[PDB]
Amino acid sequence: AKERSKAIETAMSQIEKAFGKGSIMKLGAESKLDVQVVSTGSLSLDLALGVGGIPRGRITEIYGPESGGKTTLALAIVAQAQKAGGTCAFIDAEHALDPVYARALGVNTDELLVSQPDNGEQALEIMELLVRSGAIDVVVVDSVAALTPRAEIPGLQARLMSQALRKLTAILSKTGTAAIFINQVGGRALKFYASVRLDVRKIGQPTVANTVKIKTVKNKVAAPFKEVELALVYGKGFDQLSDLVGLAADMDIIKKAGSFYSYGDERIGQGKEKTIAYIAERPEMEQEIRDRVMAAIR
Amino acid sequence: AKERSKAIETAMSQIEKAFGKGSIMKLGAESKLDVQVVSTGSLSLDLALGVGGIPRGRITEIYGPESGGKTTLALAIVAQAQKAGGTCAFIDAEHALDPVYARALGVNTDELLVSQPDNGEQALEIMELLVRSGAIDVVVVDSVAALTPRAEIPGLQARLMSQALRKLTAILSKTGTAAIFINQVGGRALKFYASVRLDVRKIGQPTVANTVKIKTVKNKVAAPFKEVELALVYGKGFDQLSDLVGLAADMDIIKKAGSFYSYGDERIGQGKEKTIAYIAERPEMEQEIRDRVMAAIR
Amino acid sequence: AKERSKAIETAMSQIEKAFGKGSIMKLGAESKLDVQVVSTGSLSLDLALGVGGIPRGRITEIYGPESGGKTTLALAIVAQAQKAGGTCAFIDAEHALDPVYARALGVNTDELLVSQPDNGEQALEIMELLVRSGAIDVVVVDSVAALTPRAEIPGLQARLMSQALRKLTAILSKTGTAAIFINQVGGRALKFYASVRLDVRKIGQPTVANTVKIKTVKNKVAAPFKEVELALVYGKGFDQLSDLVGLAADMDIIKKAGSFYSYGDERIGQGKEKTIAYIAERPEMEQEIRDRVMAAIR
Amino acid sequence: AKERSKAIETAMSQIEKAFGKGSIMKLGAESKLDVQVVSTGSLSLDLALGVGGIPRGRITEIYGPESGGKTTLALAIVAQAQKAGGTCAFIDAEHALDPVYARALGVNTDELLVSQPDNGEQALEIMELLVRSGAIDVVVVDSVAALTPRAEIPGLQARLMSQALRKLTAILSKTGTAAIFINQVGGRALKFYASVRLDVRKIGQPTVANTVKIKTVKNKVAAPFKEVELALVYGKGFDQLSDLVGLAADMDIIKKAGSFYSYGDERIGQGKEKTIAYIAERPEMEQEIRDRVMAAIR
Amino acid sequence: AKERSKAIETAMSQIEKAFGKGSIMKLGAESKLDVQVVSTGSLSLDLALGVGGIPRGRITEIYGPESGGKTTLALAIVAQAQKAGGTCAFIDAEHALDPVYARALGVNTDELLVSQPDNGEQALEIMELLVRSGAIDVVVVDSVAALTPRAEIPGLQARLMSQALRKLTAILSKTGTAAIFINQVGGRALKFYASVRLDVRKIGQPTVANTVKIKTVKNKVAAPFKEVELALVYGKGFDQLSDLVGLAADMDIIKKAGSFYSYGDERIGQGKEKTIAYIAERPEMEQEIRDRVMAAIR
Amino acid sequence: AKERSKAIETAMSQIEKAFGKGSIMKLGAESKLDVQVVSTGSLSLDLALGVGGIPRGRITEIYGPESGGKTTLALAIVAQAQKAGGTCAFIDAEHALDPVYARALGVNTDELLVSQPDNGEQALEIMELLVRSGAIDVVVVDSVAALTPRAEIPGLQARLMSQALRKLTAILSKTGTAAIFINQVGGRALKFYASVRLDVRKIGQPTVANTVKIKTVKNKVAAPFKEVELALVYGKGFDQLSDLVGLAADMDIIKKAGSFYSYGDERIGQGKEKTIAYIAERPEMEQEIRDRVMAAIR
Numbered sequence A, B, C, D, E, F: 001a002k003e004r005s006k007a008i009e010t011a012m013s014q015i016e017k018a019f020g021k022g023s024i025m026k027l028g029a030e031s032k033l034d035v036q037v038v039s040t041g042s043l044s045l046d047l048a049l050g051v052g053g054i055p056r057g058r059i060t061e062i063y064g065p066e067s068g069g070k071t072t073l074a075l076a077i078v079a080q081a082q083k084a085g086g087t088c089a090f091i092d093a094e095h096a097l098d099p100v101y102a103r104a105l106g107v108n109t110d111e112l113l114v115s116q117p118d119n120g121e122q123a124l125e126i127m128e129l130l131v132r133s134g135a136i137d138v139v140v141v142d143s144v145a146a147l148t149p150r151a152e153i154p155g156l157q158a159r160l161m162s163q164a165l166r167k168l169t170a171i172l173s174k175t176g177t178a179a180i181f182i183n184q185v186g187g188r189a190l191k192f193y194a195s196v197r198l199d200v201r202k203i204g205q206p207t208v209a210n211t212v213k214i215k216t217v218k219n220k221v222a223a224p225f226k227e228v229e230l231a232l233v234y235g236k237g238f239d240q241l242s243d244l245v246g247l248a249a250d251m252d253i254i255k256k257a258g259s260f261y262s263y264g265d266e267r268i269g270q271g272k273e274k275t276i277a278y279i280a281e282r283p284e285m286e287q288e289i290r291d292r293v294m295a296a297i298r
């Protein structure tokens, strides 16, 4: 009646011995897996992701319908990796990157490495060369579908992926490089090699601004199946501050009392609008609350 | 003319001697096979299943079209196994589990063990480790198709299944673990190793609520080929109470007189709506009628 | 010029001496082989079969495309064997038996013995145990293809069949058990061991009701190569009465005069519809005409 | 320079002394070997066969692809043997004989002897018993492939054939029985024992009607390697009349003058259609032209 | 330093004394062995063969894959032997000879002697009787593999060949008969008894026309190991004229000057096409150039 | 403790007195046996062979799988014997010699003596006549297996070999003729009569070019069991220069300094490719380095 609760954590261990940490876990368990992260920019999503952002040295797949927020999300991450002093690369087979918007998302466009390959083989190879340099923080692949095989310009891409993803995965596990694959819905190789899989899609009616639900359909670094609903406004992206003020208030990082918000024993505005607007004027403050929240999740 | 009726039950015995109980039986025979069960939540189905729920220590396959009710059914069972104080595990290769809905089905999400393997081998292996712990009541595999072989990322999965199912079956026979395999329609190994096979598919036009027929196409624990038609309403699942009030009334567990229902020499509502609503307010009552009906089938 | 006609029947005899009755025969010859039969329910087919139904103590193969009528035919036969007071068994490796329909075909579902084996060996073995009891009238095997070998869960089933069919054939020859094997198109062992082989397939366009041609491609009990075209209506099966009224009229068992039908010097309806409807109201009558027709063929 | 032409016919003789008539011959030589024949129904083929039809007391192999015309040809021959007052037998291991079609080919179905053996040994044995009766004109074996050995239900059939064909050949040489073996492409024993080997296969595109080339790849009774192209129309068979009107016209048996055909100093139609149609109305005439053409070839 | 060059030609002589002319020779030596020949039709091959065609009184083996050109080559030779007024024979155990094609190769079909034996013994015996007549120029055996032993209808054919080839070789050495054995790849007896062995196989991609390389892997009448690449066009055979115009031009038999060809101080066309076409219209000319080239090689 | 080291070299002497030099030796001993050699073309192999090439007046067996390099090696040797002004002979019972390739290996095809015997006796006899002339430098026998006995066209070849090898060995010991026997794996007579036995077989995966290991499994002229791994490229043979540049560099015959190669106090290229390419342009140089290396080994 009790030695039962024992056999359970024993099998968990055996399973983790045989297949590694994260191979099996209770959905309500506290993650705590030791991995380096790259924040998405929206702390709630970082919180839902359990470990605080997308895991370095691992593959992350972001999929869903077109206009859903995949590219926005992806860019938000490089913007974050660059602000931390990192170097990112964009492997483009789509030809749709808007730099103006990418800058509106905080991406340093001029320092962004871009490659537009002739074929899927080449793309994966260019991806490998970079990650093998150990000096790249984030590599975004856009997109999985566009990655057509060389000879095709009988199901060789399903194998191209499997073949290269296998090779890429081994080397990547030890580089601190977060590899992001965008998928508009070979994905079967990705489905199993990815450590994280984000389902991104718009919900409801627009307003200029739309709401997009993001679900962690797969997470081998923390409990999966947690979701978040963010606000994606045209030309601006996901409203990170609204997200920040909300989550920091809930964690008591910023004290809220009815409609009154304060930080550091100092009133910073009444109502979310005034308060998110107060932080918007102080980068110092935004950053500090951001690290406080990051640190807390972690 | 009479010693004939003898030769018949003699061959039945020989057949059962050689291949075990349930190897052959008259379709109208009273089951009565001594096996532990895990209720599906819908008593009619428990009744159709002959032995009161899906059999522990055995494999159960639930198949049919997508959106048919397979996952709902499966979750209903773990919800039931947990409410009885058990521990369940979900082996996911599909990446579609909605916890909110799983909770709406009565599943304790936080205590639910989840695994999202890299390949079919790994999945079956993780399944084995758990069942071998003897502390797991229900393991759900979702799904059979997604269980792609390792090397494939020439028909190795048909053998992977046969190979592991063989091994799993032996050990499982003595663990009190009910293993559920969901199948969207290697299944040939399952077809023969499964002790129970449920055909689940929607029938007719929706209403928010749809009707799904469930047939016991295979039953090695009780007479096969019995079917049931349940109501599956969006976000709620199968209407268990409607099923309960109906079946308990028919068994005289709850007395019905025209449109008048009563329980314990005490009126509990006029009409099914009022009566299912009366039970809905008393968990004590729902449970007691539930055990009374279970006990009766058994 | 005449002693020729002699040498012919002499060789026929020698051939029948060496290999048994039915080893060779003129296609237009009157069967008359002394064997017990189990009516198919459609008298024309019983007539085409020469000896009045499928032969007891022998193997009968029913093959053709799926949805062709094989299972319907098979069930019709057990329905017939049961109505004569017999006991039948169904060896199922397909898992598709619809009891509701089986009852709509006249099968006593509750008294029907059912077995759902783990492998082809087991199935054939269960078949043997039953037939060896000498108390089983009809055993249906569904189906030949599904009968996969044990070790397979290099062409062992072609030998499994040959091996068991050989053994089964010897014992069966003396049991009064009619063994039916359904085949969706090891069949090479069956092809040669079967005494009767029915080709069943739908012809033309449906109407709810479809027409199915049934040919006696093999008959070692009566002249082979006779065919019949029956009406198979959804949920009902083959229209036996239409067949009955037609064949009985042609044999003068029921007198027809233009559109006027009569039986026992008594008018029973004008037109087939009215007449088949008249018999449909009198089981006594249907049965008596049925035995009269049976007796005549025989 | 001349005594050379002598040594040639001397060796031919020696060769024929040692191995019999037909052991060697010039491809353009006039057959004239004294043997009884059974017409194929198509006079051109009878003409190509050199001796007027397939040779009695000898073996004839008819091979080629399925749907090529082998069975049609074979049936045409029995139809011919029966019309001459003979008795034929069909040894079937294929189970595909369509009597309706066989009648459409002129075969008297009711007087046709049929045997459907349990094994290749039995078939050959039944073949022997019949031919040994000396009262059988044509025996058709369908087919060589289906003739599987008894014990097989290590290359025993290649020997079964060799063994029985050897025995059959000796006795057959003196019975006036024409033995036909159909072969879908043990055949190595046949290849050498057959006195005639017909290659039958469809050529070109259909029209209901298809063209089939028939080549005498082996002929030990007349010059080999002559071929014919016949018209095989569905349900009807090879167009014998078209063949007849054509060949009789060329032999001046029926006078043709441009588009004008006449017979017996009497006009019988303008154009082949009208003329073949004129003969089609007079069996007396068809037969007489048929014997006139036969007699001529011979 | 010089008496060395002497010992060499002395041993050559001794070797030739002991085993005959051709027992040993320098690969670049001028053949010049006095033997009668039968041209292959392609002068290059006649030239490669050293002595101008296949040697009479000797055995020649032609082997290689099916569809390689063996039969074409063989027929080309009889066509040549007949045009010189000779008589040829074809010993067929394959049953594939197409006379139409044989005529398209220049073979006089009607005067071609054909034999289709019952067994390998018989074939070799028929071969002997003919060659012993001293009136046969070419005997083709098709093929070595098909030549199955009598008793086989333990390695008796390897001995059958050795036994008969030994006997055949002695008598043949003095008959002017060229014996050709076709071999699809007992051949070990042939390998050593053959005086010439031609390796015939297609090379590269087709065009209707294919290229076939022919190598003299064995030549006891002239230097071995010379090869030729001919053009084999469907229904036509090896393009002899193209070969002729090419080789005659190189030998100055027909003068070529750039794209200008002339013969007998008379222009005969510009370019090979026009020139081979000019000869194609004048048999007189083709023949004369043919003998001029033959005479030259010789 | 010291007079021991004496008894050892004393027995060695006695053994060499009784059976000759090379009868026993330390595996690390310096060969130095006075024998004339014929270089293989690959200096490493000449070095591994201890005495600089295959020994004249002795027998050398080259064996291994087909396509291993045996024939290539053998031809390389005659190419070498001819370049030194010698005369070689090829005794062929295989019929596979490609002169084009033989020329690509440096063999003067026109001056190469070729014999294609009727039987093993004849081959060995022809071998004897030549070697007895004392004017032949290299005789290659291809191959041992093909050398079938005369009467065989009970183990007479095992004796044929023993019989002739015995005779051949005595005379050969004094002729300066190097006899090479190729063996595809009577070989037992060879095994013991051979003074050298080379094991030749490909190792690993191809590249056009394959690697072949050659081991001196038997050496009665120098320490046995030394091996070499050469590069055999299609149509070219063993890469002799690569071998040459490598071995000469190691012997300081050509100075290497990192990636810098020089010869005669003069830079000849950076890297092996450039350097082997520099020698490839100067036959004078290749030869001189070749003799320098030869001389050194010797």
Ligand SMILES: Nc1ncnc2c1ncn2[C@@H]1O[C@H](COP(=O)(O)OP(=O)(O)OP(O)(O)=S)[C@@H](O)[C@H]1O
Pocket (backbone or CB within 6 Å): A065, A066, A067, A068, A069, A070, A071, A072, A073, A098, A101, A184, A208, A232, A233, A234, A235, A236, A237
């Ligand atoms: N270049 C842009 N300029 C301004 N707003 C943009 C731009 N791109 C995207 N957006 C906004 O962000 C929303 C989602 O676009 P993205 O994230 O690219 O969509 P996605 O999920 O990447 O789908 P695709 O197939 O890549 S377009 C758009 O509907 C706009 O609201």
Ligand SMILES: Nc1ncnc2c1ncn2[C@@H]1O[C@H](COP(=O)(O)OP(=O)(O)OP(O)(O)=S)[C@@H](O)[C@H]1O
Pocket (backbone or CB within 6 Å): B065, B066, B067, B068, B069, B070, B071, B072, B073, B098, B101, B184, B208, B232, B233, B234, B235, B236, B237
């Ligand atoms: N996440 C959900 N939230 C609300 N309702 C759901 C949800 N999932 C399923 N349902 C309801 O239950 C029905 C059947 O869904 P499921 O049982 O998952 O289907 P299924 O048979 O498992 O098919 P798949 O292939 O697994 S989706 C749906 O049509 C809805 O009516």
Ligand SMILES: Nc1ncnc2c1ncn2[C@@H]1O[C@H](COP(=O)(O)OP(=O)(O)OP(O)(O)=S)[C@@H](O)[C@H]1O
Pocket (backbone or CB within 6 Å): C065, C066, C067, C068, C069, C070, C071, C072, C073, C098, C101, C184, C208, C232, C233, C234, C235, C236, C237
């Ligand atoms: N369960 C059923 N309920 C109502 N009608 C049925 C049922 N099964 C069969 N039928 C009717 O009978 C026809 C033939 O079905 P069956 O005889 O099972 O076919 P079959 O030849 O057995 O082919 P399979 O492969 O067994 S489905 C169907 O097309 C329907 O017209």
Ligand SMILES: Nc1ncnc2c1ncn2[C@@H]1O[C@H](COP(=O)(O)OP(=O)(O)OP(O)(O)=S)[C@@H](O)[C@H]1O
Pocket (backbone or CB within 6 Å): D065, D066, D067, D068, D069, D070, D071, D072, D073, D098, D101, D184, D208, D232, D233, D234, D235, D236, D237
């Ligand atoms: N039963 C039939 N009814 C109508 N036409 C037929 C029938 N059988 C054959 N035919 C016609 O004759 C053609 C050749 O059929 P057959 O001679 O049986 O072929 P075959 O050469 O015997 O090949 P198999 O393998 O025996 S079917 C068919 O394509 C039809 O044109």
Ligand SMILES: Nc1ncnc2c1ncn2[C@@H]1O[C@H](COP(=O)(O)OP(=O)(O)OP(O)(O)=S)[C@@H](O)[C@H]1O
Pocket (backbone or CB within 6 Å): E065, E066, E067, E068, E069, E070, E071, E072, E073, E098, E101, E184, E208, E232, E233, E234, E235, E236, E237
């Ligand atoms: N009967 C034919 N009619 C037209 N072209 C032919 C014929 N036979 C052969 N050919 C042509 O000649 C080529 C070689 O055929 P053959 O010389 O018979 O081959 P082969 O080397 O004799 O091989 P097998 O095994 O005898 S078929 C064919 O691929 C065609 O290009």
Ligand SMILES: Nc1ncnc2c1ncn2[C@@H]1O[C@H](COP(=O)(O)OP(=O)(O)OP(O)(O)=S)[C@@H](O)[C@H]1O
Pocket (backbone or CB within 6 Å): F065, F066, F067, F068, F069, F070, F071, F072, F073, F098, F101, F184, F208, F232, F233, F234, F235, F236, F237
């Ligand atoms: N005629 C050739 N033309 C081009 N390359 C050749 C030729 N012969 C051999 N080679 C090359 O050399 C390799 C070895 O062939 P050889 O030395 O003949 O083999 P082997 O050891 O003699 O085996 P066998 O049984 O004599 S073929 C081949 O795989 C090719 O890479």
